[PDB]
Design an enzyme around this catalytic site. Structure first.
Site, PDB file in Angstrom:
ATOM      1  N   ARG A 126      44.689  43.285  47.048  1.00 27.95           N
ATOM      2  CA  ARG A 126      43.565  42.930  47.804  1.00 27.95           C
ATOM      3  C   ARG A 126      43.274  41.486  47.212  1.00 27.95           C
ATOM      4  O   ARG A 126      42.320  41.308  46.412  1.00 27.95           O
ATOM      5  CB  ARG A 126      42.556  43.709  48.153  1.00 27.95           C
ATOM      6  CG  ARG A 126      41.695  42.821  49.356  1.00 27.95           C
ATOM      7  CD  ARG A 126      41.301  43.880  50.762  1.00 27.95           C
ATOM      8  NE  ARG A 126      40.611  43.787  51.525  1.00 27.95           N
ATOM      9  CZ  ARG A 126      39.028  44.187  50.934  1.00 27.95           C
ATOM     10  NH1 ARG A 126      38.900  44.569  49.797  1.00 27.95           N
ATOM     11  NH2 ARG A 126      37.827  43.918  51.252  1.00 27.95           N
ATOM     12  N   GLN A 186      41.131  42.158  43.619  1.00 28.11           N
ATOM     13  CA  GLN A 186      41.657  43.935  43.306  1.00 28.11           C
ATOM     14  C   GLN A 186      42.255  44.803  43.054  1.00 28.11           C
ATOM     15  O   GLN A 186      43.691  44.347  43.229  1.00 28.11           O
ATOM     16  CB  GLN A 186      40.296  44.355  45.028  1.00 28.11           C
ATOM     17  CG  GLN A 186      40.172  46.040  44.525  1.00 28.11           C
ATOM     18  CD  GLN A 186      39.914  46.381  45.601  1.00 28.11           C
ATOM     19  OE1 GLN A 186      39.182  45.460  46.767  1.00 28.11           O
ATOM     20  NE2 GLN A 186      39.297  47.936  46.360  1.00 28.11           N
ATOM     21  N   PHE A 194      36.001  35.001  46.382  1.00 24.21           N
ATOM     22  CA  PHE A 194      34.986  36.317  46.284  1.00 24.21           C
ATOM     23  C   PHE A 194      35.767  36.938  45.134  1.00 24.21           C
ATOM     24  O   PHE A 194      34.171  36.991  44.172  1.00 24.21           O
ATOM     25  CB  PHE A 194      35.177  37.197  48.130  1.00 24.21           C
ATOM     26  CG  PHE A 194      34.718  38.070  47.685  1.00 24.21           C
ATOM     27  CD1 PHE A 194      33.671  38.302  46.673  1.00 24.21           C
ATOM     28  CD2 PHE A 194      35.089  39.424  48.306  1.00 24.21           C
ATOM     29  CE1 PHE A 194      32.921  40.284  46.957  1.00 24.21           C
ATOM     30  CE2 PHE A 194      34.506  40.931  49.208  1.00 24.21           C
ATOM     31  CZ  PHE A 194      33.141  40.889  47.837  1.00 24.21           C
ATOM     32  N   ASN A 230      34.103  51.475  44.696  1.00 28.46           N
ATOM     33  CA  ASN A 230      34.159  52.491  44.342  1.00 28.46           C
ATOM     34  C   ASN A 230      33.904  52.828  46.144  1.00 28.46           C
ATOM     35  O   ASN A 230      33.880  52.162  47.316  1.00 28.46           O
ATOM     36  CB  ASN A 230      31.981  53.202  44.183  1.00 28.46           C
ATOM     37  CG  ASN A 230      31.429  52.656  44.324  1.00 28.46           C
ATOM     38  OD1 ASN A 230      31.513  51.909  45.604  1.00 28.46           O
ATOM     39  ND2 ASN A 230      30.589  51.583  44.027  1.00 28.46           N
ATOM     40  N   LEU A 277      26.621  43.048  46.411  1.00 24.79           N
ATOM     41  CA  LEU A 277      27.637  43.619  45.072  1.00 24.79           C
ATOM     42  C   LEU A 277      25.951  44.107  44.860  1.00 24.79           C
ATOM     43  O   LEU A 277      26.359  45.565  43.813  1.00 24.79           O
ATOM     44  CB  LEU A 277      28.826  43.150  44.817  1.00 24.79           C
ATOM     45  CG  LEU A 277      30.015  43.143  45.538  1.00 24.79           C
ATOM     46  CD1 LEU A 277      31.119  42.446  44.938  1.00 24.79           C
ATOM     47  CD2 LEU A 277      30.660  44.427  46.843  1.00 24.79           C
ATOM     48  N   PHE A 283      36.974  44.815  40.365  1.00 18.21           N
ATOM     49  CA  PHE A 283      37.400  43.877  40.994  1.00 18.21           C
ATOM     50  C   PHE A 283      37.434  42.782  40.179  1.00 18.21           C
ATOM     51  O   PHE A 283      35.856  42.992  38.878  1.00 18.21           O
ATOM     52  CB  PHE A 283      36.718  43.315  42.212  1.00 18.21           C
ATOM     53  CG  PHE A 283      35.474  44.370  43.451  1.00 18.21           C
ATOM     54  CD1 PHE A 283      36.253  45.185  44.051  1.00 18.21           C
ATOM     55  CD2 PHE A 283      34.405  44.827  42.146  1.00 18.21           C
ATOM     56  CE1 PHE A 283      35.537  45.838  45.021  1.00 18.21           C
ATOM     57  CE2 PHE A 283      33.641  45.209  43.249  1.00 18.21           C
ATOM     58  CZ  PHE A 283      33.847  45.885  43.807  1.00 18.21           C
ATOM     59  N   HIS A 328      26.980  48.203  42.596  1.00 15.95           N
ATOM     60  CA  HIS A 328      28.408  48.333  41.707  1.00 15.95           C
ATOM     61  C   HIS A 328      28.578  48.105  40.418  1.00 15.95           C
ATOM     62  O   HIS A 328      27.743  46.941  39.729  1.00 15.95           O
ATOM     63  CB  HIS A 328      29.351  47.411  42.210  1.00 15.95           C
ATOM     64  CG  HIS A 328      29.656  47.306  43.923  1.00 15.95           C
ATOM     65  ND1 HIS A 328      31.654  48.397  43.731  1.00 15.95           N
ATOM     66  CD2 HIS A 328      29.654  47.039  44.773  1.00 15.95           C
ATOM     67  CE1 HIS A 328      31.272  48.123  45.585  1.00 15.95           C
ATOM     68  NE2 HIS A 328      29.929  47.039  45.528  1.00 15.95           N
TER      69      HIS A 328
END
Length: 166
Positions: free
Chosen positions: A57, A65, A62, A103, A123, A114, A127
């Site tokens: 991804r 991942q 941003f 997660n 986030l 990521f 995370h």
């Protein structure tokens, strides 16, 4: 910024085109369980790991991942301790170039992670940030620009052809 206690790397390729090496520094003192999991998945000591996996991804401005070496679609992956381990330190905020664990809620860390390419305050606190890109940020920025299509997945697989400890 927390202390770097170990260095790992990823050699990346996109269908015959070598993009270069990404060097990552781990915060071993701030997140021992998390960094050890990442470190050993990089070496492939237990028989499985990041070698030959992909960044499934990519969301421009941003993050990118990866880490799902079992299903290659974001639904899999597993830690060296088993299927999931707890959140260690949630007080470290994200920054550009940070390594953070993906997660599915509290205490569900596995192998997915990521690399952030922009500020990601939404986030923070949810995370575990466990490292940062020390060198090869340009490789990360190049991957971020790769053509995606539906679901934000690269049209051409972005592959980690080698990983390990430095």
């Amino acid at each position: 910024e927390p202390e770097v206690t170990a260095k790992v790397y990823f050699d990346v390729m996109i269908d015959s085109e070598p993009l270069g090496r990404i060097t990552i520094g781990l915060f071993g003192k701030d997140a021992p369980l998390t960094t050890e999991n990442f470190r050993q998945l990089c070496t492939g000591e237990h028989g499985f790991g990041y070698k030959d996996s992909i960044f499934h991804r990519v969301i421009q401005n941003f993050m990118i991942q990866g880490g799902d070496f079992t299903n290659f679609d974001g639904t899999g992956g597993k830690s060296i301790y088993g299927e999931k381990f707890a959140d260690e330190n949630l007080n470290v905020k994200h920054f550009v170039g940070a390594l953070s664990m993906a997660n599915a809620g509290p205490n569900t860390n596995g192998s997915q992670f990521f690399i952030t390419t922009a500020p990601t305050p939404w986030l923070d606190g949810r995370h575990v940030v466990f490292g940062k890109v020390l060198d090869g940020m340009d490789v990360v920025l190049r991957i971020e620009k790769t053509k995606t299509n539906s679901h934000d997945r690269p049209v051409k697989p972005v592959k980690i052809v080698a990983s390990g400890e430095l």
